[PDB]
């Protein structure tokens, strides 16, 4: 009654086992408001002398 039960499958040719679990959560939000204002004017001084 001791736990030195290494009578089968002695793998100590080092055998480094890894694990790498990885989760990720991500939300996002935007609010993009523009507002234009624009006005024009001109003048059209024309002439013709037939």
């Amino acid at each position: 009654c001791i736990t030195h039960e290494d009578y089968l499958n002695v793998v100590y040719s080092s055998s480094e086992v890894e694990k790498y679990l990885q989760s990720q959560g991500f939300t996002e939000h935007n609010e993009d408001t523009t507002s234009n204002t624009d006005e024009t004017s001109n003048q059209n001084a024309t002439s013709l002398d037939n």
Partner: peptide, 21 residues
């Protein structure tokens, strides 16, 4: 010019201001 020989001359002046913001 025909074969009287009408002649014309024209001028236009066109400013156009603008702005936007």
């Amino acid at each position: 010019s025909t074969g009287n020989n009408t002649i014309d001359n024209g001028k236009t002046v066109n400013k156009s201001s603008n702005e936007s913001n």
